[PDB]
Amino acid sequence: RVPLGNANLIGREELQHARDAVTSAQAQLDVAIQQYNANQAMILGTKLE
Amino acid sequence: NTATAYFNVLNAIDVLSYTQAQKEAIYRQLDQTTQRFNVGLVAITDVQNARAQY
Known about the structure:
This is part of a larger assembly, with chains A (49 residues) and B (54 residues). Chain A is an all-alpha fold and 49 residues long. In chain A, 69% of the residues lie in helices and 0% in strands. Chain A contains two helices and no strands. Chain B is built from two helices and no strands. By secondary structure, chain B is mostly helical. The longest helix of chain B has 38 residues, at 2-39. The A-B interface holds A 1, 3-4, 7, 9 and B 31-32, 35-36, 39. Chain A: It is found in: Cell inner membrane.
């Protein structure tokens, strides 16, 4: 969507929404990654015994 | 007849101005549609329709 806005062929609210969507997706990914890391704190990559 | 001819000329002037404005608007719409297709949000049929309208 960015190039259309560069030439002023879409509303600026459309660019704001897309950028905010990218940021929100990044935050959700961070939440998932930290959850997984929290789970891995109880194993520390050691054998079963 | 003289009065009628005078007013006909004036009406023609006004209609010409209106159609010029219409052409500007349609040209900008065609530009938008072509750019969107190039960026990859529409199909060729939309560009064909825009060209027909222009």
